[PDB]
């Protein structure tokens, strides 16, 4: 039953009885960071093609947009709401709020669904591969449909760059610090000389956050050293918590508007806050409902949005130009729409197994080596 | 067929033939670090019984303690031979000198001579798992049995921690520059404070070797900054040249004795100078054959040394009291085995697959959903 | 099997047993040269076409002419993929960069496929006649549907007369120099009177490029000869490699953009050039795709893209006012569809065979002599 | 070359040779240029990205 | 049972059993003179391929061009690789330290493979038919392969036309040694006017180098016979021992310079050392494996390198334009893979056969005949 990776040993069962069995040491197995696009990606095509098939019922240039229009948003909605279909038990939970994204079954595009059902978590002969950071995304596509639909009207209420905003839960301040470290170490590496009444020329650079402690990492900082100023907020943000994220109380007195300036995020509020998201999906549904389902279904063959529980290889796929590239083997199905959507920006797999004997080494061993043993020794 | 790891996508339909076969791009695919007493730790058991039962026979004191060694020493030697039989063409072609050590079929205890055989390069469902070094270790494996069996005869001459010797070929080589380039961004880690006329006591380090060039790289090196001396050699080592680091003339006129010593290495020349190795190993060879050969025989089932084509999944597991812990998914046997020797140091699997494709995307795709468009009816 | 191309002699086999096989002496057998238009000549009627049937489906005016436009592009792009399936593995060989081209199988009307069909290289039961250059037209033929469909917008970055695109390869540098030789020729037929120290009118004029070495040919150039400027640049271009003819390193320090001015020629480079092409063919294609390929299939009936392995007949024709014209017998559908397009701008039969003779001719001679021999001197 | 037995025989009571030289020389015509062919031969190894 | 080239003496009956069985006298009984580049001109079509297919894919400038280089290298190395494996086992012998060449195993387009077959050693009907020089075609070979896999990096160490390439071993001595008098019998055929007191200008040529003894014919060399120099060197060129010919030290005190220079060949020597080229293939192959093999195989349909026992008809075609051309009757792939690749430059069969007989002649022809004698009846 187990992963044939590689061709197994032969050999004789002196040894076998010492219960050695596989147990998970650590969770998950793998990770697979989605391209935020990927919901546009694939509605692109079906979008596009409205310009043909809107014919059927003559539609009038401006309302062929509207559909097209609808058929982004729509990609994106039907997109979280597999997402969230394959969710751990735990952020189903905590999403709780938007579960009307996940319930709504608003048919889409047949292949347009078949596409959109490869993300999400996948469970493997190895473990589980989780989509990273699958919470925040889960409300980003969310807050991608809302966007896009309030385009229809020029409502500028939802005007944001989506693929920028966090919010102040757990599973956003978790990436935020998690960005934090990444970008730290990403400018301790520029070199600043620093003349002296030593010497003369000292090309040096910032220390690495290696063993200090968070706040005297921070006192530590020369206010000379490049981006000397990020260095700064981002030491703060690997300090805050989620209580003084919300409440611009950044530790060493600084300012989450840089934190966010720095990392190039925005702080999902006001508009873009969670119940309000609700409110404006169930309306901007309902409106869809009574203004283009019907136009929609008379010129596509629909089917309905995926919600199953596992993602596919499709998802690890990247491609750039006429070539597409994976990690493991994937079947064919998995590497051909994996090639036309470019689906993922990372991948990783990091299984951990571990067993347990009931015989120390040394006996197990003793016995191995009585293996060979010749009559006058031998039990 | 392909490796069934995850479950496939559910056809899904229209996509003209693109083309899209798979290819290995990453040669090799992953690599496997053994651990360098792996053949010791498997001789252990067999070596002692040799020291248990012998007494109850007329073996003692100084022979019961040559056969005990021989055993180490075989194991060595046995060791080398099956991973020399598991190396790519050139891999061999390098090691051409020492294929004696290959041919010698002198037998082993049964078991022994089983365990031996996980050791080598893998042939898996996702490209070539390699034994990292392997030119290093098969000359190391060599080392070291010639060097076990001199202890029989306490002939200093062959006294070294073979562990840490390196020769000057091309495999000791790449190995020395990789292990520059760990000391390196390990040793950069460290800081040093600049107490400067404008602005008190600073606190910096040593710039991490990025795109900088090897040879500004030396240069820019404070000799305040922790460690100064060694970050020199080993720069000046990434930019040795075989022939450099065979003959002392390491670049910006550095010492391949510190070079060595830093990274604790040893040079292996004189004594453990290949050609060296070779005869004393032919004679060791027909030494042990007509001393000890008998003995070895008479106290356990021996059986011919292994000398496969692949090595096995158990070279990827690790053992400490009553746990083994290993990766990707292994059999019971290969768990067993693994457990028992605990051969690894560390392991790495890192696949990268490719495919063509006769049409670019775009296109591709506004076919994949034109599939979807309504037939204009009546 | 033989071409019953003329009545065979009866004759005695005394002679028989020589052995002469017939062997191709030289390759190719013919050569077909064809008008360049021949995909417009043939998309016209049904671009034309457009303006009744576009009504089945209500197209408005602007959309009607965007249809027809890429009925002409498609005509294009669906003649190259057929020469490029007839061509020797060769040319097949060093035009793979734009196999997109050949691989493409959008349907089009089923008559514009069929028509379309008839071009390419041929084997005949005399031998393989040739479309000649047919590695240049496969490419100009690309380069022209890339041009059409780039009239949907007013998209100026193709807009050339493809018809005279030339690249850096052999296949269009060997037609260089022969268009350089026949337009050399062409001009040394002029005559200048140079009145010398010598009489008086000396009606005069250019020696012929018969025997002389190409650098001598080039200096021996009077300056007074009429057109004697071009005599140098073409001269040059005889010479000239493929390496100097990229660099505009013309031997005897010549203009390129003289030689290709002469020759009246376009030097495909920049946006027609090659890698570009295929770029362009692949979104353009996938344009039409989305935004008329239901539009054109609700028109009209579509059938598959030409893609055979032989040319016809019909290529061998040419068509003015109510008469057509051939050479060689060709079967009615052949002169019908031949008269329809005139696709033909020449056309060569030059087959060459030989055979040897186990037998020296005197001998065979002997015996076909002795024939008549009588009994006191026969064998 | 290789001679039957009653030829060696016979051959050798005789020895009638005083000297024999074989010099044969075919030819052959292809319908298709080296270039063409040559192409062809190597299309075999073709993967699917890039076969007709 | 034999050839059977022509029909069959009608048995003429008697003749005692005489025991004239045949023997080879001739060996070799024929040769043929492979064209140097006959793996260039093999691995032509693919190396196309790889530059036209590059660009769709995103193979491109620098990369495009090392891919195809490889192949070309790789095409000489395997041909090399083939061309050993048929050789004498003397001549397998003396090349033994390239023997790494023979046994790399690494994978090529199949059909490329396929073509490399034809070449070798062959086993016929009328005796061995070798190719002419193997050991110096072999080494040049793979000199090539250096050659072109340094094309790579630029790297100028290994720089020269590997055809002209000629070793200090004998197999290359021979060539030289036969390239001399080919020169001479060449040269001599020129004429000189010699204007003597008795009798005006004459006309005379270099008297060629009949039964002579080789000191005298240098010495007898006028330095008026036009190229008389030359001369002088290959005469001397003809007496050199392998030593000589390794030490500059020619007979009649000439330049080996000269000697080389005359004949257009190239001292192998420094890097084209026949040891250097063993390490530096090693490091190429290596490189290979890591560096390139995944995108050839990418490309291609690979298969194993070929390694026969024979060579094949083929190598006996010559071709030009549309036309092939050969001697002795050939299969039709033996005809049809000649034609594409032009595999040889020249072409000789002359076999030599031997009987013995237990009887002289005389009384064998006597008792041939005694059977028509008539019986004396009553």
Redesign the interface.
Known sequence: M???????????D???P?G?E?NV?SIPAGEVELDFNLPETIA???A??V???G??I?LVDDDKENIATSIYGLSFFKAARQLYSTMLDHEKAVNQPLKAVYYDETPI????S??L??IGH?K???GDVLVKDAGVLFKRGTAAGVTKFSEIDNDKTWNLDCSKLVWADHSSLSMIKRLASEKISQL??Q?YR??????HV???????L?DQALPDYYD?I???APNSDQLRVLTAALQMSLAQFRNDELPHDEDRSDLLTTLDLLYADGAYEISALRDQFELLMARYTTDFKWRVE?????GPPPAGT?G???QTVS???????????????????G????PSKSFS?????????????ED???S???????K??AD
């Open positions: 187990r992963l044939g990776w590689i061709d197994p040993l032969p050999q004789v002196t040894i076998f010492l050695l596989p040491e692109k095509p079906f596009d093609t310009t043909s098939v014919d059927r003559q595009p047949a292949h347009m078949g596409a059902g490869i996948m493997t002969k190895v301790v590496k070199r620093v003349t002296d009444a030593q010497g000292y090309s040096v650079s910032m220390p690495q290696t530590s020369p206010d000379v008379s010129i596509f063959k629909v596992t596919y290889g499709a491609s750039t130009g006429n070539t597409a590239r994976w990690q493991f083997p994937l079947s064919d199905a998995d590497i051909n729409i090639y036309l959507f470019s797999l990091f299984p951990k197994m571990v067993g347990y004997s009931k015989r120390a080494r197990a061993s003793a191995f080596a009585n293996s060979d043993a010749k006058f020794y």
